[PDB]
Amino acid sequence: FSSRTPVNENPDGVQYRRGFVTRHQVSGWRFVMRRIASGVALHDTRMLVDPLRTQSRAVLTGALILVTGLVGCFIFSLFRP
Amino acid sequence: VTRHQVSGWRFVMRRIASGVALHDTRMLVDPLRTQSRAVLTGALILVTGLVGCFIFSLFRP
Amino acid sequence: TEEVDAERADYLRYLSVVRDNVRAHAAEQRAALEWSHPEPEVLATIPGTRRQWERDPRD
Amino acid sequence: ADYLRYLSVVRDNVRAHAAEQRAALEWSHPEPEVLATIPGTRRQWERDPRDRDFLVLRAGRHDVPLDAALKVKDTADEIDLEPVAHSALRGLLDVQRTVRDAPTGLDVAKLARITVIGEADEARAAIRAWIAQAVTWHDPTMLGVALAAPD
Amino acid sequence: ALALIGLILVGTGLSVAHRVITGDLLGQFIVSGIALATVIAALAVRNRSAVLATSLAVTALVPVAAAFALGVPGDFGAPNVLLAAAGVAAWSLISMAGSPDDRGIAVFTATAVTGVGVLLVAGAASLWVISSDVIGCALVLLGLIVTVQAAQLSAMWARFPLPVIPAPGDPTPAARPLSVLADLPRRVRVSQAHQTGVIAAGVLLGVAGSVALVSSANASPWAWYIVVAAAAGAALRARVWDSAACKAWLLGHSYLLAVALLVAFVIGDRYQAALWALAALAVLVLVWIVAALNPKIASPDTYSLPMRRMVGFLATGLDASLIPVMALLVGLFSLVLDR
Amino acid sequence: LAPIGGAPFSLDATLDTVGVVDGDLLALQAVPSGPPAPRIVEDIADAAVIFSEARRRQWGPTHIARGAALALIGLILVGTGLSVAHRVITGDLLGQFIVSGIALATVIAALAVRNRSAVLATSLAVTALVPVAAAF
Amino acid sequence: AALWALAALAVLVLVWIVAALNPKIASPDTYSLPMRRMVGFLATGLDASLIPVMALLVGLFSLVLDR
Amino acid sequence: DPERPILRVADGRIERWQVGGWQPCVDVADAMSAAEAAHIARRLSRWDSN
């Protein structure tokens, strides 16, 4: 339900400096960064499909396959005689 | 007491904590809970490793 | 449960800022009432000033 | 992403609006050098008291606000909005609200005295600029000039 | 200016040949002399003329590389390459900053990124012995990583105005100074320059790793798979980038690879393999000329969405399967299996 | 008025106070004025997509054609090189056959594409100097 | 080892004096958001894997390995 | 005084006199010499409609 943040009308109140980074903020930053990257490498900003994110995901999936096979053969060496 | 009861109480305690260590109350992000849960999950890594070594011991001669 | 935690976090931030706002409203009212009704020890400085008999039947 | 697409479309639309306004201004208030080529054409004296530029004399390019209103639909009262989208809309409403270096002019019809302070050379230069812009577009039946000078 | 460039090049060449063959300290001295002259001349004329300055700067890459690769005494080895790479990268980064885009940023970015790459690899090779296969794998992987991340890397390397994202409860995000927005065209031209350069560096690193992997005659079929897969990925990436030079580099990766494999075969005693590499190069040129003669092939509209998505999946699969096979190539899996 | 192939004369200037003498050919040129205003854009990605086009031409078929011609020229050259090198080092008669084949093929092709595109024909005929030289 | 510890102290004081001289790198309000998230990730993961290394340095894993 | 403005032009630009300081009214205030205005007036003296 409630989501708001009215304007503070008190001059003697508290002002919240030194903000952190929210999950929302970091997601928005990652999005705008992927959008700039798309607009630079390609000439798309409509972002209907992002092949760059797919490529990065592909390389990281390769890395995950790597580390998974590694730990798998490791525990295989240990458990088996 | 309900799940909502204990959830509300733990949250308002955490908000008091964010109100004396940090100096915000918005609780948009709660780094205090982040660090506390980090120490806890360290202990959890320890306990899972301990029982892992336990079973690993039971297998080998 | 993060659902309701974020819900109450949003509501409580909204509540903190509206608390600050209503406290500003209250302090404004109080400053007005103290401008109108000063402490008696102040009354010795009122006379012979632009504000000496200020209240008129529209106030 | 969808909202940013819509915002790019709206930015293009308001860019077209600004370009149209800029072209209209450049048509009605050309550079002071171009005034030498207007006489003897069909644009000799072409303003009449039913135009929208009748008796406005260009004084130089300035950052003029976009003539058309650019506002967001309501429900922006105190309910929070997505950060990236709201930031983009903020940037849009700030930047595109003004047309850059568009020729602006003084409306002589809504004035009664004009005091020009400055260095005599510069003051007289700007005053002659306005007078040239005035007389080179209105006819002597709807405009007139008179001067009182030491010499 | 052309005469001076020729002077620098021929001097570097002659002096290096003398320093290696005769082994006289005059070699290092004269290469260092012309190197210092070129770098100081570039840093000087930067204000008096732009194109001459960047030309001298990009030419200065040969003297410094030839110099540092020999500043290490004793026999040649990994630390020599480390020093050469360090010098190239440092000088390129120095020459890059200080001037607007003149497509010198592109070549400087390319040389700098490939220099950093070969610097890391040479450090790995020097700090502890590593077989040729490991070195080739490192090159291919690093070139891959640079290529895939080329876009956002170039974006942040152009120093774009950081995207402002305000959190709930913070004051309004005031518009950035009109000066920055006015500067923007220069910054996006620099961005395209960095983009082309870093893509080229990725291609160069890829072909270097490839030739290092399949130069020898006792190379595993896994090496051939790695090389051909990296090449096919470099080709399939040409469908992604929508600039001209980037697509050109991504396509020509396979061509340059074939040529380099040919040269490395013929340097060694592998001649039948050299003829085979020539045949493969001919196949590539045949594909090129077919695509040129028929503008209804290599036109994406001439294919259904199923086949387009199939090519996409092929690219994704090749890129993903590159590095696990790469670890299989070196004894990593064997090592962990015996530990 | 403008000195032809140059910058126009300032209007306030007197013709004698500017370098001119009888018999100079003058052009009637538009007075120089800078750009009206550059595009002002506040979205970074949209800025990138916008300003890049002022120096970017799409991939298109002409780039494919130029690249294919370049690849073909490179093939001719490096094939000649490898062929003559193998023929010298081995004398197995194979390098000879290969370089002669490349040479005859390219000298036929340099006449083949003669009317399809002039630049490609002249370029192939030029680069064909190496194959025929090595073959003979 | 005493001199090396003095050198490490010098490095710490150098970090201090660098941060105090330039107030543009002394406030993470001037770092990019992913940098701040990476700092957070480092701190969290560091304090997380601290205590397992604790119980490793002392003989717990070895204890249950033997028993 | 919006109907009776006071404009100071000596900076290379015109500035209006509002309440508190001057407010820039234009950035590049065009200005023509007496010779150009004279050329214009002469080209104008030809036509008449009065």
PDB file of N, CA and C in Angstrom, chain D residues 8 11 15 22 33 61 91-92 95-96 100-101, chain F residues 31 33 35-43 46:
ATOM      1  N   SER D   8      11.821   9.174 -25.429  1.00  0.00           N
ATOM      2  CA  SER D   8      12.571   9.542 -26.624  1.00  0.00           C
ATOM      3  C   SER D   8      11.631  10.043 -27.709  1.00  0.00           C
ATOM      4  N   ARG D  11      10.628  13.515 -26.677  1.00  0.00           N
ATOM      5  CA  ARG D  11      11.740  14.427 -26.899  1.00  0.00           C
ATOM      6  C   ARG D  11      11.845  14.795 -28.367  1.00  0.00           C
ATOM      7  N   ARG D  15      11.369  18.449 -29.861  1.00  0.00           N
ATOM      8  CA  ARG D  15      12.419  18.964 -30.726  1.00  0.00           C
ATOM      9  C   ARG D  15      11.831  19.507 -32.017  1.00  0.00           C
ATOM     10  N   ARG D  22      11.668  27.939 -33.980  1.00  0.00           N
ATOM     11  CA  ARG D  22      12.918  28.578 -34.360  1.00  0.00           C
ATOM     12  C   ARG D  22      12.859  29.057 -35.800  1.00  0.00           C
ATOM     13  N   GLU D  33      22.227  41.702 -40.748  1.00  0.00           N
ATOM     14  CA  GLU D  33      22.888  41.820 -42.041  1.00  0.00           C
ATOM     15  C   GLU D  33      21.923  41.552 -43.184  1.00  0.00           C
ATOM     16  N   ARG D  61      19.718  37.153 -30.279  1.00  0.00           N
ATOM     17  CA  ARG D  61      19.365  35.798 -29.893  1.00  0.00           C
ATOM     18  C   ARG D  61      19.473  35.654 -28.385  1.00  0.00           C
ATOM     19  N   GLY D  91      15.227  15.853 -16.492  1.00  0.00           N
ATOM     20  CA  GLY D  91      16.155  16.409 -17.462  1.00  0.00           C
ATOM     21  C   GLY D  91      15.453  16.924 -18.700  1.00  0.00           C
ATOM     22  N   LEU D  92      14.447  16.189 -19.169  1.00  0.00           N
ATOM     23  CA  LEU D  92      13.702  16.616 -20.347  1.00  0.00           C
ATOM     24  C   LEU D  92      12.975  17.930 -20.092  1.00  0.00           C
ATOM     25  N   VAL D  95      15.719  20.858 -19.761  1.00  0.00           N
ATOM     26  CA  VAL D  95      16.435  21.283 -20.954  1.00  0.00           C
ATOM     27  C   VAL D  95      15.469  21.747 -22.035  1.00  0.00           C
ATOM     28  N   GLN D  96      14.560  20.873 -22.472  1.00  0.00           N
ATOM     29  CA  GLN D  96      13.791  21.165 -23.673  1.00  0.00           C
ATOM     30  C   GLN D  96      12.747  22.248 -23.473  1.00  0.00           C
ATOM     31  N   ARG D 100      17.202  27.357 -27.672  1.00  0.00           N
ATOM     32  CA  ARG D 100      18.533  27.993 -27.495  1.00  0.00           C
ATOM     33  C   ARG D 100      18.855  29.020 -28.583  1.00  0.00           C
ATOM     34  N   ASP D 101      19.234  30.226 -28.143  1.00  0.00           N
ATOM     35  CA  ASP D 101      19.739  31.276 -29.023  1.00  0.00           C
ATOM     36  C   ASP D 101      18.730  31.632 -30.109  1.00  0.00           C
TER      37      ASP D 101
ATOM     38  N   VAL F  31      27.660  35.260 -47.162  1.00  0.00           N
ATOM     39  CA  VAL F  31      28.385  35.733 -45.985  1.00  0.00           C
ATOM     40  C   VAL F  31      28.537  34.591 -44.987  1.00  0.00           C
ATOM     41  N   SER F  33      28.525  32.425 -41.729  1.00  0.00           N
ATOM     42  CA  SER F  33      27.875  32.436 -40.427  1.00  0.00           C
ATOM     43  C   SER F  33      27.953  31.042 -39.829  1.00  0.00           C
ATOM     44  N   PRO F  35      27.114  27.776 -37.097  1.00  0.00           N
ATOM     45  CA  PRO F  35      25.909  26.947 -36.965  1.00  0.00           C
ATOM     46  C   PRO F  35      24.863  27.645 -36.120  1.00  0.00           C
ATOM     47  N   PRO F  36      23.585  27.333 -36.322  1.00  0.00           N
ATOM     48  CA  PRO F  36      22.531  28.046 -35.586  1.00  0.00           C
ATOM     49  C   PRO F  36      22.562  27.720 -34.103  1.00  0.00           C
ATOM     50  N   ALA F  37      22.656  26.432 -33.797  1.00  0.00           N
ATOM     51  CA  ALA F  37      22.900  25.901 -32.465  1.00  0.00           C
ATOM     52  C   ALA F  37      23.055  24.397 -32.605  1.00  0.00           C
ATOM     53  N   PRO F  38      23.943  23.773 -31.848  1.00  0.00           N
ATOM     54  CA  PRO F  38      24.074  22.321 -31.912  1.00  0.00           C
ATOM     55  C   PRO F  38      22.940  21.669 -31.132  1.00  0.00           C
ATOM     56  N   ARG F  39      22.688  20.409 -31.461  1.00  0.00           N
ATOM     57  CA  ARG F  39      21.623  19.684 -30.790  1.00  0.00           C
ATOM     58  C   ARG F  39      21.976  19.516 -29.322  1.00  0.00           C
ATOM     59  N   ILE F  40      21.058  19.910 -28.449  1.00  0.00           N
ATOM     60  CA  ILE F  40      21.249  19.799 -27.011  1.00  0.00           C
ATOM     61  C   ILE F  40      20.415  18.630 -26.525  1.00  0.00           C
ATOM     62  N   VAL F  41      21.081  17.642 -25.940  1.00  0.00           N
ATOM     63  CA  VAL F  41      20.458  16.379 -25.581  1.00  0.00           C
ATOM     64  C   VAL F  41      20.854  16.033 -24.155  1.00  0.00           C
ATOM     65  N   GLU F  42      19.890  15.542 -23.384  1.00  0.00           N
ATOM     66  CA  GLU F  42      20.085  15.283 -21.967  1.00  0.00           C
ATOM     67  C   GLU F  42      20.040  13.805 -21.619  1.00  0.00           C
ATOM     68  N   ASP F  43      19.802  12.930 -22.589  1.00  0.00           N
ATOM     69  CA  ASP F  43      19.826  11.491 -22.366  1.00  0.00           C
ATOM     70  C   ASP F  43      21.098  10.954 -22.997  1.00  0.00           C
ATOM     71  N   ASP F  46      20.705   8.343 -25.811  1.00  0.00           N
ATOM     72  CA  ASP F  46      20.160   9.005 -26.987  1.00  0.00           C
ATOM     73  C   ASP F  46      21.195   9.929 -27.609  1.00  0.00           C
TER      74      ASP F  46
END
